[PDB]
Amino acid sequence: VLTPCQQSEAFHKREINEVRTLENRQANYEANSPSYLALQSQIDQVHKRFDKYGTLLCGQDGLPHLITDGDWRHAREFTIPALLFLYITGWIGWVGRSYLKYTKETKNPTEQEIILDVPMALKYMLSGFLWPLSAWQEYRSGQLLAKEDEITVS
Amino acid sequence: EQWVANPLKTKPLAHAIWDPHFGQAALKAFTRGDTVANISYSGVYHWWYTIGIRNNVELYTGALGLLVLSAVF
Amino acid sequence: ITDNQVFVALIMALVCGYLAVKLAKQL
Amino acid sequence: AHTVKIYDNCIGCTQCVRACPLDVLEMVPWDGCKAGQMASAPRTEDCVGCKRCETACPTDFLSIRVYLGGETTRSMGLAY
Amino acid sequence: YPLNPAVIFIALIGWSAVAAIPSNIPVLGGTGLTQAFLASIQRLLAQYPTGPKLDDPFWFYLIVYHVGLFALLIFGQIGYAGY
Amino acid sequence: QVKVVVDRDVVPTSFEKWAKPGHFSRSLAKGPKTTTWIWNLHADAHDFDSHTSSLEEVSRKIFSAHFGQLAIIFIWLSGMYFHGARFSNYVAWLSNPTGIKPSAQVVWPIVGQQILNADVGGGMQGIQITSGLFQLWRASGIVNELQLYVTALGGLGMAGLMIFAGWFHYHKAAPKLEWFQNVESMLNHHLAGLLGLGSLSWAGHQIHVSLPINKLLDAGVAPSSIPLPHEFILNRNLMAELYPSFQQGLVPFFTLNWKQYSDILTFKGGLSPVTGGLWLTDVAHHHLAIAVLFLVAGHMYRTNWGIGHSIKQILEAHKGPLTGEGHKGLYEILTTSWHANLAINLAMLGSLSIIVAHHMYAMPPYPYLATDYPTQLSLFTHHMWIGGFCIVGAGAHAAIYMVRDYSPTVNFNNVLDRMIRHRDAIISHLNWVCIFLGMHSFGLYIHNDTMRALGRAQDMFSDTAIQLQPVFAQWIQQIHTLAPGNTAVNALATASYAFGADTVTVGSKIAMMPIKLGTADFMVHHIHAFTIHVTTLILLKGVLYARNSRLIPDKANLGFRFPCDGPGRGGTCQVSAWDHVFLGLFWMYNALSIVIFHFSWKMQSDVWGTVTSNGAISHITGGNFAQSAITINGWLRDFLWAQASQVIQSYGSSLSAYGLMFLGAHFVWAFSLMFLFSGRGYWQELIESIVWAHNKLKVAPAIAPRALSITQGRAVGVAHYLLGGIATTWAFFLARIIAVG
Amino acid sequence: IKKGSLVKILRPESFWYNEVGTVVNVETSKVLYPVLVRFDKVNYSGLNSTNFSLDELVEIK
Amino acid sequence: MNLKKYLSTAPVVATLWLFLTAGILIELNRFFPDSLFY
Amino acid sequence: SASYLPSILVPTVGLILPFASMAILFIAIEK
Amino acid sequence: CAETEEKYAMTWSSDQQHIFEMPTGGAAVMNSGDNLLYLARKEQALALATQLRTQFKIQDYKIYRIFPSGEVQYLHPKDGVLPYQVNKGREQVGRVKSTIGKNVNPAQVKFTSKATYDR
Numbered sequence A: 001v002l003t004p005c006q007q008s009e010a011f012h013k014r015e016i017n018e019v020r021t022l023e024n025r026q027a028n029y030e031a032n033s034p035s036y037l038a039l040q041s042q043i044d045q046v047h048k049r050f051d052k053y054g055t056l057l058c059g060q061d062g063l064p065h066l067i068t069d070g071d072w073r074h075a076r077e078f079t080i081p082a083l084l085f086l087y088i089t090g091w092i093g094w095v096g097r098s099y100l101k102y103t104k105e106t107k108n109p110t111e112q113e114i115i116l117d118v119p120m121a122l123k124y125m126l127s128g129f130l131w132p133l134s135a136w137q138e139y140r141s142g143q144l145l146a147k148e149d150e151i152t153v154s
Numbered sequence B: 001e002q003w004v005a006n007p008l009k010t011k012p013l014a015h016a017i018w019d020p021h022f023g024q025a026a027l028k029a030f031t032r033g034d035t036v037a038n039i040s041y042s043g044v045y046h047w048w049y050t051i052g053i054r055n056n057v058e059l060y061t062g063a064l065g066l067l068v069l070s071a072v073f
Numbered sequence C: 001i002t003d004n005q006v007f008v009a010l011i012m013a014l015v016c017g018y019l020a021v022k023l024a025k026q027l
Numbered sequence D: 001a002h003t004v005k006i007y008d009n010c011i012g013c014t015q016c017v018r019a020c021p022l023d024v025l026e027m028v029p030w031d032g033c034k035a036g037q038m039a040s041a042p043r044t045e046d047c048v049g050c051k052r053c054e055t056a057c058p059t060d061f062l063s064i065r066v067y068l069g070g071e072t073t074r075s076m077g078l079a080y
Numbered sequence E: 001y002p003l004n005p006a007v008i009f010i011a012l013i014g015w016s017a018v019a020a021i022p023s024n025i026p027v028l029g030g031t032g033l034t035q036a037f038l039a040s041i042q043r044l045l046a047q048y049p050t051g052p053k054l055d056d057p058f059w060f061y062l063i064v065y066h067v068g069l070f071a072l073l074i075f076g077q078i079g080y081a082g083y
Numbered sequence F: 001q002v003k004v005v006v007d008r009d010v011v012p013t014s015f016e017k018w019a020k021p022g023h024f025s026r027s028l029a030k031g032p033k034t035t036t037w038i039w040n041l042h043a044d045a046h047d048f049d050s051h052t053s054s055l056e057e058v059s060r061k062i063f064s065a066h067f068g069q070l071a072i073i074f075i076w077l078s079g080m081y082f083h084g085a086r087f088s089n090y091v092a093w094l095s096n097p098t099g100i101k102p103s104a105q106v107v108w109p110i111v112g113q114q115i116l117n118a119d120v121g122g123g124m125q126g127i128q129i130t131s132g133l134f135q136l137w138r139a140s141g142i143v144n145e146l147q148l149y150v151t152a153l154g155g156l157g158m159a160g161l162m163i164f165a166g167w168f169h170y171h172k173a174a175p176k177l178e179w180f181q182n183v184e185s186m187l188n189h190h191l192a193g194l195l196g197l198g199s200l201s202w203a204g205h206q207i208h209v210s211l212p213i214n215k216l217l218d219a220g221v222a223p224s225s226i227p228l229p230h231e232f233i234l235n236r237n238l239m240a241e242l243y244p245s246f247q248q249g250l251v252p253f254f255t256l257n258w259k260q261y262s263d264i265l266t267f268k269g270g271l272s273p274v275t276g277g278l279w280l281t282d283v284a285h286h287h288l289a290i291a292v293l294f295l296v297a298g299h300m301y302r303t304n305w306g307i308g309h310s311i312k313q314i315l316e317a318h319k320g321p322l323t324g325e326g327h328k329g330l331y332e333i334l335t336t337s338w339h340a341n342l343a344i345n346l347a348m349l350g351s352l353s354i355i356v357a358h359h360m361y362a363m364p365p366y367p368y369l370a371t372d373y374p375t376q377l378s379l380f381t382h383h384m385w386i387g388g389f390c391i392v393g394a395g396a397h398a399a400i401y402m403v404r405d406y407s408p409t410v411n412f413n414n415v416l417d418r419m420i421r422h423r424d425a426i427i428s429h430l431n432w433v434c435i436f437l438g439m440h441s442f443g444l445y446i447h448n449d450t451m452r453a454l455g456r457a458q459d460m461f462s463d464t465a466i467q468l469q470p471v472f473a474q475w476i477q478q479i480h481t482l483a484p485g486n487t488a489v490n491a492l493a494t495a496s497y498a499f500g501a502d503t504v505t506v507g508s509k510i511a512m513m514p515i516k517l518g519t520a521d522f523m524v525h526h527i528h529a530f531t532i533h534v535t536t537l538i539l540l541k542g543v544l545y546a547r548n549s550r551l552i553p554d555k556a557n558l559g560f561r562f563p564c565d566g567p568g569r570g571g572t573c574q575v576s577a578w579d580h581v582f583l584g585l586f587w588m589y590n591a592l593s594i595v596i597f598h599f600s601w602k603m604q605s606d607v608w609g610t611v612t613s614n615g616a617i618s619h620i621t622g623g624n625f626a627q628s629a630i631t632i633n634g635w636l637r638d639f640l641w642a643q644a645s646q647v648i649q650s651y652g653s654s655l656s657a658y659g660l661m662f663l664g665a666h667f668v669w670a671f672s673l674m675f676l677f678s679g680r681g682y683w684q685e686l687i688e689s690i691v692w693a694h695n696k697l698k699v700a701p702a703i704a705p706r707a708l709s710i711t712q713g714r715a716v717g718v719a720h721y722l723l724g725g726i727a728t729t730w731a732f733f734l735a736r737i738i739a740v741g
Numbered sequence G: 001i002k003k004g005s006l007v008k009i010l011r012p013e014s015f016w017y018n019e020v021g022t023v024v025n026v027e028t029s030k031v032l033y034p035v036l037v038r039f040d041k042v043n044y045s046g047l048n049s050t051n052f053s054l055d056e057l058v059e060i061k
Numbered sequence H: 001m002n003l004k005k006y007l008s009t010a011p012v013v014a015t016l017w018l019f020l021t022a023g024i025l026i027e028l029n030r031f032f033p034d035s036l037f038y
Numbered sequence I: 001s002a003s004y005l006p007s008i009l010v011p012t013v014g015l016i017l018p019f020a021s022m023a024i025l026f027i028a029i030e031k
Numbered sequence J: 001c002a003e004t005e006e007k008y009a010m011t012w013s014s015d016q017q018h019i020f021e022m023p024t025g026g027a028a029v030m031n032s033g034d035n036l037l038y039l040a041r042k043e044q045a046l047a048l049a050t051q052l053r054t055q056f057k058i059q060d061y062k063i064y065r066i067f068p069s070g071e072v073q074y075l076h077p078k079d080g081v082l083p084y085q086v087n088k089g090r091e092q093v094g095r096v097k098s099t100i101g102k103n104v105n106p107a108q109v110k111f112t113s114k115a116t117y118d119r
């Protein structure tokens, strides 16, 4: 059963064990060593690390699990970086497709791919920002796809 | 059938060994009864024990009963 | 667990061996 | 033997015969191309089958297609 | 090709006599390179099963005498190259 | 004669041809219609005897390229001196070296990886050095951070002189070929000028820097009371206290009373019992011996003054009867073909690097080097590995000579091709020696494997069982015990303490123990002779069958990196002189993997470890070699199962980056097999079946996406098999010995 | 038909099958494969320059 | 003059873009480390 | 339980059967 | 060996004593006037024909195939002219009517002793 992670026992056992275990090296230095300040910053980055995983679900393992159902209580877990990611490589993919359908109609398409025309490249890098309703409106013209390309025997 | 007497305890034996390469020290690393047989890791005594073979005699009549069938095929 | 049943078995698979070599030199 | 067959795509550019280091291939005057030539493979008893012809066959797809057939002494290329 | 299989013993003259009288004392042999060997083979020659790895002047003056003796007989066949 | 004719303003220096990739090859300036142009661009980036046959233009290109290599090496050493300066704990390491583990690289604090900063002491953390730079700096006498900064900045200065030198010697002053075929002068300046003045000037550094400094650090002086090497030459008085022969000046040198220089120079050998290194009196005396001996050596090549040899009149004079012509032609081979010179120099360079490894483990020449065992391990191992690869470079570039630059007119009946007349009798007897040593080097391991597995340990090859005591190695090692009284008359100790007397300990750490060789060490030496003979088989089969085999009698007409001939002759895959080098790299991995698996486990059983009270002994595995190296279950269990345990439990600690470079190197090793086993007849229409999925969405790439070629599609399987395979033993070894030593 | 015309192929072992290409030379001397067609892209032989018959001569407009 | 063509090639712009997005990941993981939400 | 039969049958199938089977098969290359 | 395998003896003439390379290996003496040369297999021999012909003129050359019965053969050339050059004596064998695209499917050839292209 996925307990809420802020109250799970083995979670806070890992809190005591890692703050104490990393803290064992912190007594190897004086009060004004640069390493001692670095492990001050590291202990801060462990208490923040465990307070910022409060609303997750760590089960009996004491390790924060995830949920990928789109439950809308786990939306910040999976689906918000899911839609975020699909926007980012939809950006990248529409940039690359748009640049290849640029260099397909140029003088010499071979030299276009070694030496990227950074004018027209950085045109398409930035212009491919709104690929759902630009790739979709280039799909409604019947132009994202193709037909009767290369194939083997049958 | 010694395994049928004690199914949890006794480790089930496969066929026996005749190595002329076992000098002495390996011969004491296999003694499960008088034979030095391999422990049978194939679940066959469990299937023959749910079948209800509780004997070695029924296994001989079965072994003859499949030499007959192999000769038939 | 007995003795003569083993001999009955090796006779029956000797016959089965002759039927195997009888299948061998015809196909 | 390794059966060499030379189809009607053979436009007679003769990189095949120059590419064969066995002289299984020769050129035959054949009035069906612009050069008037079409290659022939009469002596396939010496044909290794190394497909060095098919590398240097600049047709559409392989006018000369080597099919790997029999394996004699000469067609296996063993020295002894 | 070996047209001159003439002499071998000229190396035995040529390698023992150049290595007998120079003693050069504080090494294994206080005597020369060969005198420390001929004395240290006659103790072992009469079918002695001994001579272990700690037998110094048998093994060491075995190899160091054979390695110059081989070299001087080979150079003796090089002594039939100027013909 | 000797004269230097130099073309000026050879090549203009605009960035125009950088915009033309593949400008250099007219076979490759067509531009990429396929993606194989991308990889052929890099496979022809240094085929200098494939750009143009004109050896002048080639020779300018290579000779300018060497300065680029030395520029990268001076950037590398300037990097090591700066990471020694700003980032290392070397100043604190100089106080107590046996307690402080050496660290330079201080990992930047991003997510997690700040835990790699190992608290190695010195008050400052960071990942631990295994390269052994601090031992060479204590030997060289670098006291504080200032010489590391300044020597780093001089490293960048020489890097600028090598970039400017290479630009200067390709573009605006580049020589003729008559400069290059003036090779008696080249040997005449490299024997004498490079190595002679190198060892002589280094004897200057050791006598006027290291002998006072590593006398004071041997006396245990803190690195603040130590004066600068500066201050030992303003007056002889600070050195006459340390070495009282400096008071006499150079006067006993010029009168040849060299008995007086017993303070500065001696012949003692052994090791320093205090620092665990060689005596720098012996090392400075040694570099004087290389000094005078190489300056003698340089002057045997007639250049202008009619005094000295020429190589032609040497090689003609050995007109032996069983070779017929003698060495006629080799001065014309080695001064017209670069690849043959690269074969010789990579063979001797690689075998020198192996010699470096074997001379560094047993005579540890740096102070406190044998104390920290990871620097003792990885400087054996690293120089063993480059010392391996360079021999395969000999086996390749010998074949690149034999395919390209062979000409039978200059090379007719001499010592060279008379081998190739009976190369069947060469390779056939290598075949026999490989089978005989494989049976008698590994069949003994299957024997002891079975006899230990069959219970009958009375039939093994142990010391208790049928023994195979190495007779010859124990005998000559016993001679090396008896050296410094008998034959090395003016010595005191032996050539090493791998030979003779009782062990040398520094800080309760065993610096060197006399290595015992009994009946297991024997069989591993026959492993090494075996897998050396197999690489010699593949790398002589790669050269004698390079140009014209009896399978394929025109390979020079096909080239060097051709994949094959075809399915004819029943299949002629992998038959080129390059493909034997493809095989010799796997056998390089085998041969050196069991060299270092002999090293790092015999010396974790027979040498290294600690010493306790009353001089009592303790090894790391605890004498667990001769009862365990005889089998393979003892080898795999007791070595690869047991020594892995400090690499595998290394998580949550500073050794966990080796726990990442262990698994990832298993990944790269396993990832090579995809390239080795399959071939482009699969991947080309797998890829083209993906090209359908780009042609459907108009994402057809204009450079056509081929698969790799065959030779690239096996060269990359080598270069992953070796990167993953070598980095496994890398992470395993450094995570093993850092975790204890 | 003519030189310079942009021609789709209908032969399944053409590498450029169902891809248009430009006509370079046509011979009218009963050569069985007279219409030499080269292409933008490149087969595995490295060679765009091939030739075809008249049944595999389908142009576009 | 033609250096900017060399700074428009495939590997150089590959390093000047993967170096840049690499710096986006590292500079976005120094400022907000341990980011499993959102 | 005839405890002597593997002492006969294990060697005569283990070694001497791949002698006569080498003869029957290997001469049966030419028969 | 020579008592059971077809030795290939290559006979040719030259003008000057040059030096070529054997297919067995190494440099050969190359008798200037006329010289025969026993070999092992045909690719060695025509590889030597490429070895000499692409360098310089070695014409009036052909291997007499010593088959072990005792007599010879003659292949390169037969009509006296070089094979990629076109002579009006050679009869072409080894063709079909079209490309591979009209070759028969091997399920139409299954259980018959035919080829995948004869039709």
Ligand code: CLA
Binding pocket: A092, A093, A094, A095, A096, A097, A099, A100, A116, A121, A124, A125, F689, F690, F693, F694, F697, F699
């Ligand atoms: C122009 C950019 C671009 C675009 C839009 C696509 C799109 C596609 N590829 Mg892909 N691909 C690309 C480049 C691209 N590819 C490159 C450069 C390679 C070589 C590494 C591949 C190798 C590849 C394989 C092997 C496969 C696909 C497949 C696919 C399809 C499924 C999506 C997927 O998993 O992608 C796969 C994505 C990758 C393998 C990694 C992405 C490739 C690079 C890193 C990103 C591309 C950005 C591009 C370089 C930007 C250049 C332009 C810009 C400078 C102006 C999809 C149509 C699959 C398919 O057929 O599915 C139907 C498939 O099996 N691709």
Ligand code: CLA
Binding pocket: F063, F066, F067, F070, F179, F180, F182, F183, F185, F186, F189, F190, F192, F193, F194
């Ligand atoms: C005694 C003079 C001398 C010295 C010291 C060297 C030293 C070297 N030569 Mg060299 N060489 C010389 C004479 C000399 N050469 C002559 C006379 C010829 C012509 C026959 C050549 C032909 C030659 C070739 C063809 C090659 C070398 C290479 C090398 C380098 C090997 C790499 C190495 O050891 O790095 C250790 C590095 C050092 C020890 C640094 C050395 C720098 C010091 C300052 C000496 C350099 C002085 C310089 C040569 C004087 C030029 C005069 C000019 C300024 C007016 C090394 C720097 C190889 C190389 O890498 O190319 C550069 C190479 O391929 N040499």
Ligand code: CLA
Binding pocket: F266, F267, F268, F269, F270, F278, F281, F282, F283, F285, F286, F289, F290, F293, F359, F360, F363, F364, F365, F488, F493, F494, F495, F496
């Ligand atoms: C008297 C001068 C002298 C001194 C003090 C040293 C001292 C040293 N050398 Mg040495 N060396 C010398 C001369 C000298 N060498 C000469 C002249 C050569 C070239 C032949 C070498 C070649 C050499 C190698 C290859 C190695 C050393 C190494 C070492 C170190 C190991 C410690 C030891 O016990 O070695 C004592 C040294 C010796 C027993 C060498 C004696 C060499 C004699 C002087 C050669 C005489 C030359 C002459 C032509 C005779 C040659 C044939 C002869 C054998 C019959 C030590 C610092 C090892 C090292 O690097 O340490 C890690 C190592 O691997 N040396």
Ligand code: CLA
Binding pocket: F430, F431, F434, F435, F436, F437, F438, F439, F442, F443, F446, F534, F537, F538, F583, F586, F587
């Ligand atoms: C572990 C796998 C393995 C093994 C055992 C071998 C073994 C061998 N390789 Mg090798 N090889 C391997 C992997 C392996 N290779 C891989 C992965 C590559 C990839 C690059 C190569 C590439 C390679 C090349 C390129 C060459 C070899 C060659 C050889 C042979 C060297 C001669 C020798 O040692 O004979 C001794 C044999 C052994 C040690 C094998 C064990 C034999 C035991 C000891 C005795 C017999 C067992 C048993 C009694 C048999 C009877 C019972 C049975 C009949 C029922 C040897 C058989 C060379 C060759 O052709 O031979 C010279 C050669 O040129 N190998």
Ligand code: CLA
Binding pocket: B021, F439, F440, F442, F443, F444, F446, F447, F450, F459
């Ligand atoms: C190749 C390495 C090797 C070697 C050297 C041995 C050696 C041995 N094994 Mg063995 N073994 C090996 C591999 C090897 N094994 C492997 C790989 C396996 C597993 C497959 C086994 C499995 C095995 C078992 C199961 C047993 C042994 C046993 C033995 C011992 C007796 C065998 C015997 O009678 O020899 C027979 C020897 C010969 C017939 C001699 C032939 C070779 C001669 C010397 C060649 C001489 C040629 C000559 C030099 C030509 C030059 C001179 C001429 C020109 C005049 C013997 C020590 C037995 C034992 O009890 O150990 C004590 C035993 O029970 N082995």
Ligand SMILES: CC1=C(C/C=C(\C)CCC[C@H](C)CCC[C@H](C)CCCC(C)C)C(=O)c2ccccc2C1=O
Binding pocket: F674, F675, F676, F678, F679, F680, F683, F706, F707, F708, F709, F710, F712, F713, F714, H014
């Ligand atoms: C997988 C495989 C391939 C396919 C390998 C493909 C073709 C290469 C994949 C890696 C390249 C580098 C991808 C190209 C991507 C570019 C780097 C652009 C990406 C954008 C940035 C990363 C720069 C072979 O070609 C092959 C050939 C012969 C034997 C075995 C194999 C084989 O196993």
Ligand code: SF4
Binding pocket: D009, D010, D011, D012, D013, D014, D015, D016, D017, D039, D056, D057, D058, D059, D063, D064
């Ligand atoms: S087929 Fe290709 S190679 Fe053979 S001749 Fe016609 S064109 Fe030249």
Ligand code: SF4
Binding pocket: D004, D019, D020, D021, D022, D024, D025, D047, D048, D049, D050, D051, D052, D053, D054, D066, F568
């Ligand atoms: S098959 Fe081998 S030999 Fe016969 S032609 Fe094609 S390539 Fe030349």
